[PDB]
Symmetry: D2
Subunit: 343 residues, 4 copies
């Protein structure tokens, strides 16, 4: 017997927002860095960590030129930055929505070790969820983010880690669809270790298949969802060298073997790659001579912003040039969504 999770209207608005996210040429910036993370990056530039610093850095990120307007469809934010206002007086979700962007928010509470395993973890943030996301829906957020972590090793990932991860991810996605906010499924696989393309392709295949089995168990609506996997990439200590074309071919085979086409879009991680290399890989991924029944776009935290970071210097008088560098990468990533990029 069936009792529908969603009315047809709710599925319609989730479909509208999901289509608005991965419109062709439009991509996702991840401004969701937590205080420890952004503190590490601001120690890397060598300045102090204050709220005004984070606010001014996101004043750099969000108030850029109008050339980003057919580039950025949505941006993920931290909980803190929702309630900060710009120097014009406008709150940041209005600044995003004015140039056509959609507000996203990182909602998880970090990582917890799994007992009985070897360094595996699961994610935190299940409690108070409906009230929190309802508040964020009142505050204009329309999609959200949850990040689960898996790593390659001797015998890892175990089936326990994959099973629990997909299960709580489905729990997340159900709660997101209950009030009308789009979830993005992000099964992040660690690129750490030394492993070829083949073992990595096998592992993301199994974990993604387990993910979609779990989602189909929980009566998810697939068009009201997004997918945020990693590009399959060999390990940091892997001595074997590969072309971009082989990585892209393994990526589209690992994607095509499990993902149902009723998912509206697929967006990739940075995954610790270079600023130019991730763009090259995405442009190759779009250039594969196969059939892709979804949107293939970019969701880059560091890869969009680390150049603007390195150009900022922590000093205000640079920002525009820094903003310009930000714009540069965005335009490249825009063409990397459409398969027309060349370096």
């Amino acid at each position: 017997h069936s009792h529908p999770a969603l009315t047809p209207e709710q599925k319609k608005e989730l479909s509208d927002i999901a289509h608005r996210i991965v419109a062709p040429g439009k991509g996702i910036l991840a401004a969701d860095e937590s205080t420890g993370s952004i503190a590490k990056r601001l120690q890397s530039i060598g300045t102090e960590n204050t709220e005004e610093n984070r606010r001014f850095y996101r004043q750099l990120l969000l108030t850029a030129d109008d050339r980003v307007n057919p580039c950025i469809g949505g941006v993920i934010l931290f909980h803190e930055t929702l309630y900060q206002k710009a120097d014009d007086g406008r709150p940041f979700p209005q600044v995003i929505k004015s140039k056509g962007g959609v507000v996203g928010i990182k909602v998880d509470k970090g990582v917890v070790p799994l007992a009985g395993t070897n360094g595996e973890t699961t994610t935190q943030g299940l409690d108070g969820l409906s009230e929190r996301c309802a508040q964020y829906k009142k505050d204009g957020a329309d999609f959200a983010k949850w990040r689960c972590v898996l790593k390659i090793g001797e015998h890892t990932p175990s089936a326990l880690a994959i099973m629990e991860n997909a299960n709580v991810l489905a729990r997340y996605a159900s709660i997101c669809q209950q009030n009308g906010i789009v979830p993005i499924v992000e099964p992040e696989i660690l690129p750490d270790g030394d492993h070829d393309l083949k073992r990595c392709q096998y592992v993301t295949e199994k974990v993604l298949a387990a993910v979609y089995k779990a989602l189909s168990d929980h009566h998810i609506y697939l068009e009201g969802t997004l997918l945020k996997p990693n590009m399959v990439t060999p390990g940091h200590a892997c001595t074997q060298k590969y072309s971009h074309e082989e990585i892209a071919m393994a990526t589209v085979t690992a994607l095509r073997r499990t993902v149902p086409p009723a998912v509206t879009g697929v967006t990739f991680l940075s995954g610790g790659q270079s600023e130019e290399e991730a763009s090259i890989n995405l442009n190759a991924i779009n250039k594969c001579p196969l059939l892709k029944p979804w949107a293939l776009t970019f969701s880059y935290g560091r890869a969009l912003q680390a150049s603007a970071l390195k150009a900022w210097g922590g000093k205000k008088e640079n920002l525009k040039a820094a903003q310009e560098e930000y714009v540069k990468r965005a335009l490249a990533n825009s063409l990397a969504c459409q398969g027309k990029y060349t370096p």
Copy 2:
């Protein structure tokens, strides 16, 4: 850790045969009717059941006009009919392969009731499988068929039935890929009962998702496989009336929500429909304004042949006209594969 089931060459030949099955405009005839089934159909025409009768009826089926040659890509056979020869002297697999067809064979051993359930069944035929299919591979068969049965009721299908069915189906498919013969996954849902389109859509969604989870557990190669589901159709005693367009829309939604696009083709059942109605439904299914990343074709036992049955009369002097009627339906089904049919 990974140990590959197949060498790249084996995956290549399975890909070649799978592409040759669902080439655009090419479809599957099911001449695999068992002795009780064909005895019932020949009691329906009112003649006796002999081996020469079955042989002559398949002389009608296989030796038709050359107009079927860009229509029938493959045909499923019984074990008996592999070892029968035509009046010209040629064995029937050569007669199929001469006009470009591919030999298929029904290999299961029937249905067994499940204990503890309410009229559910599972399928037989797992033993001696590698030797039997290796013999069939020597005898020219390149793809095979297995039929599992599910029904809608008060609380049925239970999860036990779906789980066991998908599990043994995956066992089948693995054994088929071990020697180089293509399996077709056929999760047949009974149209018996009274139930709307929505409950049926829900049930085929769940059972197909469980199927593909099971297949991904068993390291199946997806491009070396086919899918044989039912069109979602309301029950025989269901009083609610529906357009063909709603059935086709529910079909492509139930298909698009679970099937990975690395499956090469999808072919439908007759499912007890009319001769014209199944063609109308398939032509509508191809005419849906969505994105389908596979081949959508027809696999009709009765629906291709019952007209030729009704035109045969059991008497030899009719056959050509009977064969002509067979050709008629095939041509219609051919256009029904391409979306260009009109009645």
Copy 3:
């Protein structure tokens, strides 16, 4: 490959505490009633809801006669009542530990509806868990409680509800064993509805088997755990009448068919029964002529205390007599643990 969740010492102390809980003749009082619950019960006696009222009521509950000392081995508490002190000045966990009791605490955050289902729920309280239970371990709590809810209906429980419930319950139990606090598994089945003994026996069998499969997936240590199921009882609107002996026989069959004997003890719910009836049922359950390889004891929230509630009147001058009534039931339940009770 194996990486042990627990060192042998940790398993040893969990075994010590688990043995100390279900020592023969020792049972569990549930003083864990939330503010809405105890507000409903204090509206039932018709007084106001203050913190001093709740404190004075638990002054009734915990400061009773020394005759309860070989009766109550442990007591479950609310988070609020851990930090309240008695009129002598001693904090309540010291008052429990002085007479030999062990401190327990309810840690979940309530119930959340499941989308796509018909009135099913799952439980809240997974976040901040390690820090909270570590704080409770510093504050003297040694075991904890988590309550998940299932109900009988037309097609409910679905497999989704059972699967998610057992999964998050295992997540709970793992986190409890990580720092050294004993979890009790409580799969509460609703007695609401109208259903015979047989359907109920079937449902608790399936959900308990799924529970222990989930626990064995998560590398739980079974001797460091407890089990808190319901006695199988027909529904409130079930017209069929049954003896206590049939209920007890169905209970020990439903218990013996799934529970591994390396669980240290099993303690039952009140389940909305009468004050005398639950004691009669437990005494019959211990009197079954089968083989029980665990402790079978009582964990009664209302059934131990509702008489003392009805004798209290909200007025201080009664308390001792009220306390006496409390003692009465405890002694009965003590003999009901040992099979020597008669009414």
Copy 4:
């Protein structure tokens, strides 16, 4: 909703036969050796392989002294030996039933490699099962045997192997209970390799828990079943030395952590051990100071018979002395069932 697999009468007769199998002091001989196996053992004694040889060897095995009559409760047979008759004229099942024994039969069809894995296998023999076991029930067989194989290695057993193995084992057990013949669950783990007691204990724990989850899925009746696991034993190339007491303690912990007590009996494998060592281990297993809620007995193919083999010489004039040696081991194993054996 519930539809019972068995009527209460059927459960009663399965309970009677299961109680008659593992009555205290009564054990199981495995005379089920296939033609290749018994051909290898008769090549080891250095004679020819004929049907009269196998018949005469089982004339040694079954027609022994009356001292075995409170020792052997049941004996497993091959399909061939059911239809062979003794020199007195009596058929062998009557010879077993005359001295109080119960007829058992090995029904599987051997092992098949699993694709995609590293040397894993699954078992054959699912087809024609109801008719075959119904014939065996007419021919006096009351219980049956099925042998599935798992091995320890680098990353093996995979979850696929365990899952498929438990699934088809449950399918077997259901079919056995459908007509009234008792199944014994035999999850044989290979002792080959080099591995400590701990990894082995972990692996049998997981596979046995998965087994009982699968059995509870398929509505098995637990009192109408038996369990045939291995004693946990370190590998052949494992250099670590262990006492018998540690092996027995790990065995009863691995048993007590998953087996429900509604299983009537547990009987062990030989597992390639010595003739004396397996008896010492079983006598220690019964001598553990824990609580065992079942029968713990011996099911020894080679360990009961290899002495009589080595005393036979292939020549008829020895047999009685050879039979005497057989009796010797049986008596020892009888005391090894009761914990009163000493070497």
